[PDB]
């Protein structure tokens, strides 16, 4: 009801992922990359 903020997704990155690649870095991308 108050909102579940535990789940996050990446919005910003300098490139696209390769198959089964994982990127969990939090360095601010030209913005904080996760929302």
């Amino acid at each position, epitope marked *: 009801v108050s909102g579940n903020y535990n789940y996050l997704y990446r919005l910003f990155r300098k490139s696209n992922l390769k198959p089964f690649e994982r990127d969990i870095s939090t360095e*601010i991308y030209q913005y904080f990359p996760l929302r």
Partner: antibody
Amino acid sequence: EVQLVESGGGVVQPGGSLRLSCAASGFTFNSYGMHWVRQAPGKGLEWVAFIRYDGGNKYYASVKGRFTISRDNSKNTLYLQMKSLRAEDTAVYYCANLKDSRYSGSYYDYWGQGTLVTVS
Amino acid sequence: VIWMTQSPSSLSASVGDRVTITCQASQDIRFYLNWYQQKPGKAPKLLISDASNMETGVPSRFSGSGSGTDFTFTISSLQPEDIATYYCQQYDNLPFTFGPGTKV
């Protein structure tokens, strides 16, 4: 000792061309990727191009479409072919092996002395 | 293309003073930054790799740290031999880029 020796500099006219070379010795040239970096009087360091150890993949900066990078691992020589040179390309051209944990993997950083190219 | 900047562009300090140079990236480059020192008439010399690792032979008075977009280069005590232009360079992705350069 490790050496990188640039040559082939000089003065050319606008729209002309010039081929530079860098002779390498003292290290396993054929296992490393190589970079070209230039510096004009009054300015900072500008990255120009990179070639992989096998002479396969090539990358370019402001110069893409005009400059070509190549190497010959049997002569330990790195080349840069510059076509359609402009006044803005006046600079001292260095060959280098830049320490890089992501792409070339080089653990050591080497530089040449640089050769001056003037366009006018 | 990742754009690099440095601040201040030029600084005035005496021998024995503490000197700090800030390098900032337009994009997050984690810890893949090199620091170079260039004296007039000479090729650039590498002092620091991977943001904070010192090169062999580099005096202990030199140091640096940082991650992401904000990096710092420090001289704990400026020596008369430390007058040079300092550059930061990113190698997170191609093309590689150098900063404007800071005059000490």
